[PDB]
Every structure is written in structure tokens, then in C-alpha cells.
Amino acid sequence: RSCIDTIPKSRCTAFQCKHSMKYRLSFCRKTCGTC
């Protein structure tokens, strides 16, 4: 997958990164540090 967020990054919160796999893998790969 591409190393970009795919929703506005203000929604890529610490809470979502920590507690949601879909946010880590689909929506917020860059901001969550996934890639």
C-alpha cells in the first residue's frame, strides 16, 4: 500500500492509531507510523 494517509490527518489521532487496526492500515498509515 502507499505510505500516505487516506483521510484528513486531523482524524489520524493518537487514540485511533493506538486502538484501531483499520486506522493504522487503511486510513492513517503515515501518521500512525505504520510505514
Give the binding site for Cl ion (CB under 5 A).
Answer: 1, 3, 13, 15, 22, 35
Least Cβ distance, residue 11 to Cl ion (angstroms): 7
Least Cβ distance, residue 16 to Cl ion (angstroms): 5
The grid coordinates of residue 18 equal 493506538
Residue with the three cell numbers 486510513 = 27
Question: Which of 7/35 has CB closer to Cl ion?
Answer: 35
- Which residues, in sequence order, are bridge partners of residue 28? 5
Least Cβ distance, residue 17 to Cl ion (angstroms): 9
The closest alpha carbon to 25, from 8, 1, 9, 14, belongs to 1
